[PDB]
From Swiss-Prot, chain C:
Family under the similarity heading: Belongs to the glycosyltransferase 3 family.
Protein activity control: Allosteric activation by glucose-6-phosphate, and phosphorylation by a cAMP-dependent kinase.
Domain of life: Eukaryota
Further details from the record: Present with 14600 molecules/cell in log phase SD medium.
Organism: Saccharomyces cerevisiae (strain ATCC 204508 / S288c) (Baker's yeast)
InterPro entries, per database record: Glycogen_synth
GO cellular component, one term: cytoplasm
Name of the protein in its database record: Glycogen [starch] synthase isoform 2
GO biological process: glycogen biosynthetic process
Protein task: Glycogen synthase participates in the glycogen biosynthetic process along with glycogenin and glycogen branching enzyme. Extends the primer composed of a few glucose units formed by glycogenin by adding new glucose units to it. In this context, glycogen synthase transfers the glycosyl residue from UDP-Glc to the non-reducing end of alpha-1,4-glucan.
Amino acid sequence: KEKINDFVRGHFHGCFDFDLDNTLYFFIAGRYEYKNKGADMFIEALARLNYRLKVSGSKKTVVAFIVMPAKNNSFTVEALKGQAEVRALENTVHEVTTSIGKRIFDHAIRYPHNGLTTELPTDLGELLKSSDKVMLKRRILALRRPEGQLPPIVTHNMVDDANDLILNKIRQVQLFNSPSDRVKMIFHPEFLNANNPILGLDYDEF
Amino acid sequence: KEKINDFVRGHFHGCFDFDLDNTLYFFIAGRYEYKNKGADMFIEALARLNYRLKVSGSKKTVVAFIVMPAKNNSFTVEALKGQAEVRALENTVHEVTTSIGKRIFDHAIRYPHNGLTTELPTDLGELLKSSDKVMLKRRILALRRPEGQLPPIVTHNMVDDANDLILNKIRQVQLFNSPSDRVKMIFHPEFLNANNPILGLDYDEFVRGCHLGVFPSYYEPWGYTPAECTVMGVPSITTNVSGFGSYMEDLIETNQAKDYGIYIVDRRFKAPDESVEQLVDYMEEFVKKTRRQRINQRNRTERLSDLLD
Amino acid sequence: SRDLQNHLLFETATEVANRVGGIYSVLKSKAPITVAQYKDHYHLIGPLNKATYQNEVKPEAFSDEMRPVQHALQTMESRGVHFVYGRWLIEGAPKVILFDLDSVRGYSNEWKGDLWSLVGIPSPENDFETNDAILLGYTVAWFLGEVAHLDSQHAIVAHFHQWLAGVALPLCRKRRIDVVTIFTTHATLLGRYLCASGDFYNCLESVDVDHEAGRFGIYHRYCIERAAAHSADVFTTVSQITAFEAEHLLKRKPDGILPNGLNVIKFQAFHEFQNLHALKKEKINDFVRGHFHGCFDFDLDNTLYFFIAGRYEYKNKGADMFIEALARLNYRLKVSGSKKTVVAFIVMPAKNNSFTVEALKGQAEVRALENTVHEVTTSIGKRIFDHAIRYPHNGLTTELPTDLGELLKSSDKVMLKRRILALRRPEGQLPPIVTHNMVDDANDLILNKIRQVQLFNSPSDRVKMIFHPEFLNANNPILGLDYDEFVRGCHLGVFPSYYEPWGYTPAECTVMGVPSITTNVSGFGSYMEDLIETNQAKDYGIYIVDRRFKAPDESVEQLVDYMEEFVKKTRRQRINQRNRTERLSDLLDWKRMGLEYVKARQLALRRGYPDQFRELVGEELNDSNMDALA
Ligand SMILES: O=c1ccn([C@@H]2O[C@H](COP(=O)(O)OP(=O)(O)O[C@H]3O[C@H](CO)[C@H](O)[C@H](O)[C@H]3O)[C@@H](O)[C@H]2O)c(=O)[nH]1
Ligand SMILES: O=c1ccn([C@@H]2O[C@H](COP(=O)(O)OP(=O)(O)O[C@H]3O[C@H](CO)[C@H](O)[C@H](O)[C@H]3O)[C@@H](O)[C@H]2O)c(=O)[nH]1
Ligand SMILES: O=c1ccn([C@@H]2O[C@H](COP(=O)(O)OP(=O)(O)O[C@H]3O[C@H](CO)[C@H](O)[C@H](O)[C@H]3O)[C@@H](O)[C@H]2O)c(=O)[nH]1
Ligand SMILES: O=P(O)(O)OC[C@H]1O[C@H](O)[C@H](O)[C@@H](O)[C@@H]1O
């Protein structure tokens, strides 16, 4: 589930208004038989489940996956690019916390001398400096989404996007991952695998 | 130098009141001959330097190492235990900052949503929790040292402490590492090694980490100790009655040679109490140097190593 | 009347509180050295950019001796003129005076009329910009008259940058305002325009200045530039090649050069710049592994990183030569059996739709391998450790493991192999020559040139092409470097320019210890070929290609010659050459290039008050140049 959470954090970069500790992951998977496998019901049922959860004022979120292989031209740039921009933040944060560590450790080993009245630092400014902030802000701006763009409902470029049953059905019931929706949709038109650069999980792990 | 800094932090746990970024590492080394190798003069000179700095009001700090093997029963528990207590803290800090990361990270990626009005956390309480603050304080507590205890002048338990010359000389000049002393004193009666559990540097590595070798010998046919120093771009103070000292006095004009890291004290044509003041002059000069200066001097000292090939 | 030892300085340009062009960065970086000399006697002047100025910008306001500046500001207020006073928020904190041109346009037709008779300059009012150039030039001379009038202690210097600011120069000359003037032109008008087609440097001695200016239809601007250069007590350019250029095309030899320095950020240790190089070289190495994923047949340790960067001017910046030359070098290197490799970067912004999937995906797959390795190596760690500590018990005869199968298990071998296969690229696919999706790929000039010389990053090629049509930035998810960080990590900048009045590209490059190849028709190349003998300058990291007294094809062959030279170097040799280049940086710091700005100002006071300067120094020194003076 941590590897999924990681994928999701990328996916909703810029539009991430919910709590993964209070988030659930439904999926459907298999051969793309829209009608026999019941993708139709699934999508419809989810659209309604969304309405119920909104009405009840629940704070939970459902991120719902469709793993049915359809013809595609691999991943989208937007998928790969935001998963990269989220790692960029992860890393800059790790660097910054290394610096904070030095600053804490100096205070801890220098107490009680040099006028260090408290055992630990108290002001955040003692630990976090302009150079540190500037990085973090730049990495944050990189995650900003455009004017009103919503997280996508598909991870790939589809061959025949306009005729795709699953996608037309999601568009029809209007699950577009706008913030208010407590049900999110992610169609991944490709069997899962560990080499997958955006959700590196063999199916069995996912 | 970092590896020496980790040792010193250990050694001074509790009584740590100076900045290692404005601290210099002098050392004397080799076969324990109190009189011949110049340890008498060294320790005295340092006590006089300690006076000069307090007087002149210097922000600097000197940690003077003595590496001369002597009869001993291995390390003190207090050196060995303090090393562990300083690492306990290093590893508690590393855990806390991880927690801090996760929080900073969550804020960044969530902003501007969920009522987050600033791009970064502003108040420290968002990052640093009580559970985190408790483990840290406990680690700090373990570094406290007893009422009026000071950092030791010895890293080992001596066989015959009460009669050892080096230890008695230090006690006599009254360098007990109190916070008001600008010169500290760490006698390590054992040849340095990488497997040393308090200071895990081979001798050559330690040399590089230090700032200034001081080998003010009285008898010394050659003196590899300052020669090795000089090969590693480390300024050394030696004497004209040493072989190496005499040789470098031939090759270079004695006032040039200070810019080239080879300080030469006069122990042939001067009173022993004038020798000591010249050795103190040279140390007080080096302490006055900026980092610009030390680095440049170190490059000159390095470039000089061709002559010793 | 006036004092020359304590004088005022009023620097005036278009680009004060707004980064419209190169001139921005000159004034900005120079401000620290010019504040430090003058303190409160220095004042920058320009037009108030209502939009962006919000970013960058009482009896207490001035001292007693600098009260005359305060009184003259109130006299501009007494005819209604709105003006922003303050500090410019950059190193040095110089004081700015930003005139509102919206609150002086009611004079426009009168003032454009005045120019018909005072100098004779037409003003087609369908030219949005020359209007603003005239409004500033009159508003500033309306101010400099009042300060010369209200201050009778100091001498006064008024420096103007580029033709747009210098409408005020004829007005200071004709009206006989009591200030000494300096004009500095960073590029001639005709020069930029004549270089459109292409042979500028040979056949500019004979060109009809008025017929040519008239044919491009920019005669009304040319007039303002020509007027400015003649009017001023001192006329200057930013480089010798531009001085040559300015002599024939503006009809006045300059009194000297004001070459553009940089605010050189120094380190406490000199050798720090060198450690950075290797750090940032590793970030590029990370990129290059991702790029060649699957076709990775060379040793990055024995690999060099050439680059060109800047505005996308295919001809002027010399991308044409760079690519042609790189193709020829590839032949040489193959012929000569060299084992080295060159990855050449072109960093010139072109219209794109961000990165390719292949680019992002490739470096994602390389990170997956990085991490699966990291998992496997901890397992190996655990096994080495357990053999170590258990020795010599349980039958362990050797101190350490000797069979790899002891440390690397099936489970570990499988996931490494899977990661390997993921990097495998389609049969006969090569590494791309572009990181992005181009909007108009088939018509991109760089990509046509590259396709034509057939640098396609096949494994036999010792020169690889990477066109990255976008300025470098830290946030970039494939090559996460700010431009400065990338430069440092590279080994050789190559900026074989044709029209380039200065070129900060190679100067920046040199500041950060990186050798460049520039040309003798660039302003920076002129200035170094004067300061250093040209064969010696190669040892200090300044390779200068002759694009003036050589055929285009010989220039190319010289550029190839120089690269081949640089490739041949050993690592010691590159490291030192880099050290020599870094030592050179002080010549480009404002702590030296700002002395030439004083020489211009000492010559302005010499011609302006010949008797007063004679008596304040001793005799009268030579009058003709900046260089001929004290
Ligand atoms: O990312 C994924 C997702 C699913 N799977 C695998 O794919 C299978 C999904 O099964 P299908 O959707 O292919 O359909 P079934 O195999 O359940 O059933 C099919 O095969 C049966 C026996 O051949 C019948 O013939 C039946 O009519 C036909 O629907 C699962 O076992 C699962 O392990 C993956 O490997 N990777
Ligand atoms: O922690 C340490 C410190 C030093 N050393 C090494 O051991 C040497 C110790 O030097 P000494 O104190 O033994 O002095 P020298 O070897 O410079 O000279 C000595 O050896 C000479 C030749 O035998 C003469 O006898 C002379 O009187 C005597 O001073 C150093 O050079 C260094 O190489 C270590 O291995 N570990
Ligand atoms: O990835 C990059 C690459 C370059 N740069 C910067 O972009 C500049 C490149 O400048 P250009 O090549 O666009 O041109 P110049 O700054 O040399 O000069 C420009 O301004 C001059 C005077 O205003 C002339 O008009 C000239 O013709 C015009 O190109 C460099 O300073 C460099 O710092 C980046 O920030 N990121
Ligand atoms: O010039 P290069 O071949 O990139 O190598 C250059 C060198 O850079 C710096 O000097 C580093 O300290 C060395 O680690 C490296 O050997």
